[PDB]
Design a protein that fits this description.
The structure is cut from a larger assembly and holds chains A (264 residues), B (53 residues) and C (283 residues).
Chain A (H helix, E strand, L loop, with lengths): L9 E5 L3 E5 L4 E4 L9 H6 L7 H15 L2 H12 L24 H14 L2 H10 L5 H9 L8 H18 L3 H7 L8 E2 L6 E2 L25 E3 L6 E3 H7 L14 H4 L3
Antiparallel strand pairs in A: 1-2, 2-3, 4-5, 6-7
Helix pairs in contact in A: 2-3, 5-7, 7-8
Chain B lengths: L11 H10 L3 H11 L9 H8 L1
Helix pairs in contact in B: 1-2
Chain C lengths: L15 E3 L6 E4 L4 E6 L6 E7 L5 E6 L8 E5 L4 E7 L2 E8 L6 E6 L7 E6 L4 E6 L5 E6 L7 E6 L9 E5 L4 E6 L5 E7 L6 E6 L10 E5 L29 E5 L6 E6 L4 E6 L5 E3 L1
Antiparallel strand pairs in C: 1-2, 2-3, 3-4, 5-6, 6-7, 7-8, 9-10, 10-11, 11-12, 13-14, 14-15, 15-16, 17-18, 19-20, 20-21, 21-22
Classes of the chains: A mainly alpha (264), B mainly alpha (53), C mainly beta (283).
The structure holds zinc ion (4 copies).
Chain lengths: 264, 53, 283
Amino acid sequence: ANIPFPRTSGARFCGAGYLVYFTRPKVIIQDIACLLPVHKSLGELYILNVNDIQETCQKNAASALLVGRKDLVQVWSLATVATDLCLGPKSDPDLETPWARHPFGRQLLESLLAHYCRLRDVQTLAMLCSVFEARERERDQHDKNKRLLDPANTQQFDDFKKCYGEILYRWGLREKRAEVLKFVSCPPGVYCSHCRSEVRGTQCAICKGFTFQCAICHVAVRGSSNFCLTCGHGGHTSHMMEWFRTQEVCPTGCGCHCLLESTF
Amino acid sequence: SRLPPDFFGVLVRDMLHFYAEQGDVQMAVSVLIVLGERVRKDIDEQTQEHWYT
Amino acid sequence: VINTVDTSHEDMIHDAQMDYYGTRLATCSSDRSVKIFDVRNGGQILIADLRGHEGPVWQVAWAHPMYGNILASCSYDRKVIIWREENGTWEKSHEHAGHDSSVNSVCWAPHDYGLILACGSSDGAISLLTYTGEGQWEVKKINNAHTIGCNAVSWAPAVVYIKRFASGGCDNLIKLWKEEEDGQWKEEQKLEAHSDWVRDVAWAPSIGLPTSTIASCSQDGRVFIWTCDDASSNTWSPKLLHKFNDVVWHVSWSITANILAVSGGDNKVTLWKESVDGQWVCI
Ligand SMILES: [Zn+2]
Ligand SMILES: [Zn+2]
Ligand SMILES: [Zn+2]
Ligand SMILES: [Zn+2]
């Protein structure tokens, strides 16, 4: 008629390192992970600091050694030597030539990036773009010139990080996804005790006072907290963590088993 | 595997020319003498003579 | 490795797909049933034996975990039926049967847009179901899609929005679509290099390279790779990879779009990889 003929054999890529297929005579799951540029172990062992980069580079070089990435130990050592604080740019354009104009800066970064783009390795691209982020018409051109990443290609550098974050979410590591996504350039009613008003914040606007008061501690809460939806009593998070570890009543003698109301 | 045989063979030449254009032939000549034979057959014969002289 | 699983079904198996994490496995069959297993550490455990869908099921498609546990399942009975997992139990949630003929393909949209499911039936139309909130679904149809009927659909990766998918059908022409500012799903282009019948189409994931890649499969047997890297010229150049001796059924990409797996009527599964010279070799 018009319906096509039934399918009886197929194969799909599922997960981040798996293959699912079935054939005419059962379905089996084969771990096709030695066929992909990315690596699961490196994702678990890669650290990414923002204060000490000189330690990040060496820590990742050791991790790359532990797995057998000979080509990557070179790259990480080169990044280590090319990112010292000794090569900091100066504000005046006439004082010195920047390190970016040197052939061992931007021109070598773009010589590694194109090679890895051809090899199609998101992991290294995303980790490299994160590490290397740190009259008057002239001063503007100088500011554009003293950077190791071209300011006219920010989009690509961001989508690299985005795709790697999605991969890390697939694998199952949620802290290391936030750490990576932290480098993306673009961005993503508590009652008061003095006037009984709905104030949105840690400080009131009528009496200009603290609105939230710890229900164990009675020191004003300005940071993180949690509370029950119905009773509306809560305070510092560790305080309730200790309290509710062994009891099941509202600490202010309210009568609610907040464990059954706060947690859905 | 590894990085390709000569992946940086086109950057040391640019570094040498970069240093020689500013008038700093000391660095270029010293690097040429130290390296010896890995950068030798890349620079034209009439440029090494100029830099040495 | 291997994780052998016995289906314990009574008829043939038409589709099989795993979850977004590597922990569950859904199976369609020809017994009007959809069995959800739990493939962890080799376990062939059972969690559900969902029934209904009078005809034989043909395809399944899991949703993004950020929206919870959902599963779309089309079949011959011209009905798409959608599942959830409430309080640790799988149940029928909503059915939609706005198609005269059998619905052949289902494909979820990228999660950045939201929760949109595209279903193309054999009556030459595409039905898009949008989750409007509070358990409400909005349906917008595209009548007179293909001369005979659509067979497979695919969604393009989201870039910085312009929603855009790609459908193929029994008219031997691959079509592209785009949603206008008002909401009109205006046609943009059409590609014609096949001969017999296109069965499955697949659009490559993006990792930032300015290049869009679409695979295709024909009934006579030809996998054509439609590269296009002209930025905003909207020009596509077909290529070829082989000419088989059967009906090519399905093609699937990898997460980094470097390996293609093609399965057809030859009762075999082949893998492929692009070489440095620009030719596609097996492995
Ligand atoms: Zn107040
Ligand atoms: Zn306290
Ligand atoms: Zn209370
Ligand atoms: Zn309570």
